[PDB]
Structure 1
Amino acid sequence: SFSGYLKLTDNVYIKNADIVEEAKKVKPTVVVNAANVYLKHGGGVAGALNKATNNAMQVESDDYIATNGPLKVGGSCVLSGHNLAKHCLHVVGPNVNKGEDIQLLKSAYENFNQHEVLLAPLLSAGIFGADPIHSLRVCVDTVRTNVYLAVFDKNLYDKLVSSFL
């Protein structure tokens, strides 16, 4: 199972870890990808999860987009987890660097409630430009299912834990 996670609340846990390495080790039922609406997995968590699948996530995602069109900001889709997980829940948090509404971050986290347990990154954090402290607060106040947060950045992990109310 998951190991080395600090318990933040009844259902939210956090670890300073690369989500790709956590997924390879744990092979959870659901790994969350920090996706964009086009499922173009170029960088950050998406690029790293996709690279770990040898681009199979991108091929599957391109077929999904060709059939269904883009996701909404705040939306999600369930696709294969390939070699990393049973499923990948691709969730689109707002990208603040694109002027996307930060209120959609709560909508994005609501997608996690459809899954009993998830391995996930902090939505809209990192290259998406939102305040990770705010993202963790929205996570804890929105997600009711068991979420194991993998925070790649060590200094950010320390700051998130020490400032947690």
Structure 2
Amino acid sequence: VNSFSGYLKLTDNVYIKNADIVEEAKKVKPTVVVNAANVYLKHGGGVAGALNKATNNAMQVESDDYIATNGPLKVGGSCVLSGHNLAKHCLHVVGPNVNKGEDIQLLKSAYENFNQHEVLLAPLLSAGIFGADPIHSLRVCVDTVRTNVYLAVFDKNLYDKLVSSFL
């Protein structure tokens, strides 16, 4: 039993809700919140911009030190950093950004990072401003993640479309 509330159960391990991931993380304080990151951990917009803003830019400060030490992530890769005031940890995961011409096949690799964590609050990878089809991203999430994932979707029309189209 966990403290995630109001989710629709899609499969044995995947749950979905129309919600703002920032407001969800503040309420639940999950062990892990997933950020929709880029390789440079530059948290400018989308989920990344919103999560970083909620940390008062502490996420960005920590991320800049991470990059200065380690260099960029790989597309499909991840790193674990602090969750600041939002969660215990933030798993920064880089899905392919179709608006950069990146290979959508790497979306499965991106979701594989979730399997290293027993429970996660997460967005749909490569959705929103990353330019991928969210229906496909959900398909890949369900077919790749085996640990317990709570997917937040703030856009209602999208959420309703995702539920109503789910196979």
TM-score of the alignment, normalized to the shorter chain, above 0.5: yes
How far 1:87 moved relative to its partner? Answer: 0.1
Identity, in percent, stands at: 100
Give secondary structure in 2 for the equivalent of 1:28.
Answer: coil
Deviation per CA, 1:26-77, whole angstroms, max 9, x where unpaired?
0000000000000000000000000000000000000000000000000000
Between the two proteins, the alignment pairs up a number of residues equal to 165
Give secondary structure in 2 for the equivalent of 1:60.
Answer: helix
Q: Which runs of 4+ in 1 moved over 4 A?
A: none
- Aligned mates of 2:61, 2:115 — CA distance in 1: 27
Give secondary structure in 1 for the equivalent of 2:68.
Answer: helix
Deviation per CA, 1:91-125, whole angstroms, max 9, x where unpaired?
00000000000000000000000000000000000
- Relative to the length of structure 2, the TM-score reads 0.99
How far 1:152 moved relative to its partner? Answer: 1.2
How far 1:158 moved relative to its partner? Answer: 0.2
- Aligned mates of 1:22, 1:115 — CA distance in 2: 18
> What is the CA RMSD across the aligned residues, in angstroms?
0.2
- Aligned mates of 1:154, 1:125 — CA distance in 2: 14
How far 1:16 moved relative to its partner? Answer: 0.1
- Relative to the length of structure 1, the TM-score reads 1.00
Alignment-derived partner of residue 30 in structure 2: 28
Give secondary structure in 2 for the equivalent of 1:77.
Answer: strand
How far 1:25 moved relative to its partner? Answer: 0.3
- Aligned mates of 2:93, 2:8 — CA distance in 1: 23
Give secondary structure in 2 for the equivalent of 1:31.
Answer: strand
Choose the corresponding residue for 1:48, options 47, 50, 74: 50
Where do 1:117-156 residues align within 5 Å? 117-156=119-158
- Aligned mates of 1:116, 1:133 — CA distance in 2: 24
